[PDB]
Design an enzyme around this catalytic site. Sequence first.
Site, mmCIF file in Angstrom:
data_model
loop_
_atom_site.group_PDB
_atom_site.id
_atom_site.type_symbol
_atom_site.label_atom_id
_atom_site.label_comp_id
_atom_site.label_asym_id
_atom_site.label_seq_id
_atom_site.Cartn_x
_atom_site.Cartn_y
_atom_site.Cartn_z
ATOM 1 N N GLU A 5 -23.438 -6.810 14.381
ATOM 2 C CA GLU A 5 -23.553 -6.857 15.831
ATOM 3 C C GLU A 5 -22.884 -5.624 16.430
ATOM 4 O O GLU A 5 -21.720 -5.339 16.141
ATOM 5 C CB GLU A 5 -22.877 -8.132 16.340
ATOM 6 N N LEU A 6 -23.620 -4.892 17.261
ATOM 7 C CA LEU A 6 -23.088 -3.671 17.870
ATOM 8 C C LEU A 6 -22.206 -4.016 19.063
ATOM 9 O O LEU A 6 -22.659 -4.619 20.037
ATOM 10 C CB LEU A 6 -24.234 -2.753 18.315
ATOM 11 N N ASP B 220 -4.649 -9.772 8.672
ATOM 12 C CA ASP B 220 -4.560 -8.457 9.292
ATOM 13 C C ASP B 220 -4.947 -8.497 10.769
ATOM 14 O O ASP B 220 -5.592 -7.577 11.274
ATOM 15 C CB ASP B 220 -5.468 -7.482 8.534
ATOM 16 N N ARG C 234 -6.504 -3.007 16.318
ATOM 17 C CA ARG C 234 -7.409 -2.058 15.669
ATOM 18 C C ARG C 234 -8.573 -2.780 14.978
ATOM 19 O O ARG C 234 -9.598 -2.169 14.671
ATOM 20 C CB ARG C 234 -6.643 -1.228 14.633
ATOM 21 N N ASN C 235 -8.416 -4.075 14.724
ATOM 22 C CA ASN C 235 -9.449 -4.824 14.011
ATOM 23 C C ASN C 235 -10.273 -5.705 14.942
ATOM 24 O O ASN C 235 -11.079 -6.514 14.490
ATOM 25 C CB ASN C 235 -8.824 -5.674 12.898
ATOM 26 N N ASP D 256 -13.071 -6.826 11.672
ATOM 27 C CA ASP D 256 -12.822 -6.320 10.318
ATOM 28 C C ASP D 256 -12.102 -7.340 9.447
ATOM 29 O O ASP D 256 -11.121 -7.949 9.875
ATOM 30 C CB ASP D 256 -11.983 -5.038 10.356
HETATM 31 C C1 LIG Z 1 -14.757 2.101 13.606
HETATM 32 O O1 LIG Z 1 -15.433 0.876 13.295
HETATM 33 C C2 LIG Z 1 -14.770 -0.342 13.444
HETATM 34 C C3 LIG Z 1 -13.416 -0.498 13.899
HETATM 35 C C4 LIG Z 1 -12.839 -1.785 14.020
HETATM 36 C C5 LIG Z 1 -13.596 -2.929 13.690
HETATM 37 F F1 LIG Z 1 -13.044 -4.145 13.805
HETATM 38 C C6 LIG Z 1 -14.930 -2.810 13.239
HETATM 39 C C7 LIG Z 1 -15.543 -1.521 13.107
HETATM 40 C C8 LIG Z 1 -17.011 -1.401 12.626
HETATM 41 C C9 LIG Z 1 -17.169 -1.961 11.203
HETATM 42 O O2 LIG Z 1 -17.950 -2.149 13.464
HETATM 43 C C10 LIG Z 1 -18.294 -1.757 14.759
HETATM 44 C C11 LIG Z 1 -17.822 -0.617 15.475
HETATM 45 C C12 LIG Z 1 -18.227 -0.312 16.798
HETATM 46 C C13 LIG Z 1 -17.678 0.890 17.477
HETATM 47 C C14 LIG Z 1 -16.443 1.503 17.277
HETATM 48 N N1 LIG Z 1 -16.292 2.581 18.084
HETATM 49 N N2 LIG Z 1 -17.386 2.698 18.809
HETATM 50 N N3 LIG Z 1 -18.227 1.703 18.465
HETATM 51 C C15 LIG Z 1 -19.500 1.654 19.156
HETATM 52 C C16 LIG Z 1 -19.141 -1.222 17.373
HETATM 53 N N4 LIG Z 1 -19.627 -2.333 16.721
HETATM 54 C C17 LIG Z 1 -19.209 -2.600 15.435
HETATM 55 N N5 LIG Z 1 -19.711 -3.743 14.788
#
Ligand SMILES: COc1ccc(F)cc1[C@@H](C)Oc1cc(-c2cnnn2C)cnc1N
Length: 285
Positions: free
Chosen positions: A91-92, A143, A147-148, A164
């Site tokens: 999911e974005l 965790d 940041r997550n 995460d």
């Molecule tokens: C750096 O990545 C992460 C950092 C922390 C997390 F918890 C998950 C992720 C990754 C795995 O997932 C996504 C990232 C983004 C994102 C990040 N910065 N800009 N966007 C648009 C949007 N949707 C996600 N699903």
Amino acid sequence: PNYCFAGKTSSISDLKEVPRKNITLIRGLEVYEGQVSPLQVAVKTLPEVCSEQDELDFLMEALIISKFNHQNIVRCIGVSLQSLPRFILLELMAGGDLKSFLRETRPRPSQPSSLAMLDLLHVARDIACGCQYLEENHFIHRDIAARNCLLTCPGPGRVAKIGDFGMARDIYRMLPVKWMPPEAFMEGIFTSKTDTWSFGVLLWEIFSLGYMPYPSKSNQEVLEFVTSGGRMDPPKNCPGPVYRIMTQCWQHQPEDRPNFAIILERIEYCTQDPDVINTALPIEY
Ligand SMILES: COc1ccc(F)cc1[C@@H](C)Oc1cc(-c2cnnn2C)cnc1N
């Protein structure tokens, strides 16, 4: 390689493989923004240059996320493991990660009310619901930290979600010291009360607007500080009731700490208290 979550075992075969032709990368964000045919997605990529372990890690991460079913945990749209490089489709979350958002959206002279106390409470509430879900399903995140966490969008409709699970993935088969309770350092025993402690630190991160916890302290200094009873002071301008939740999360004895049902209950009380939500956040210069 199997994965057990709740009342079900699952393997690679149960993962929803998406035909590679249906997947388009739009831009980098190792994650890219992508499209599947049209669903906006984030794409986590496994580098083709990697070891056998990286591959089972990547696979176990997909299994873990794919089995969750809650609106405050990022969804897995699917996987593409039969083409290289391999993809996990998530999911974005357009608002980006929570820590970066807090730092970028801090109240300033050019936007003095970009953010308010109620907004921060809603984020804390969202993650707490996510955490309650993990707790009642006996999954320990290990965790919990800003940041997550991810946000669906920048603006007032935003929803915070846990994004995460790399730490839990490793454990299932790098301690985040500043997010960890005393017993983790000394006993190595982990419980859902571990997550309760971390949530308190997350709460502090949120209401500090994205400061590093225990400012000016190194990891070892934190470890000795916390083991000896020391706790962070409230963030600037933090409402007394919100700080109280943090300190309850940080009780030395795990069993003294609230479970997430109680935390959620107390956050809701805060959301209903005008003396809390009418408190202004510091303006940064
Ligand atoms: C750096 O990545 C992460 C950092 C922390 C997390 F918890 C998950 C992720 C990754 C795995 O997932 C996504 C990232 C983004 C994102 C990040 N910065 N800009 N966007 C648009 C949007 N949707 C996600 N699903």
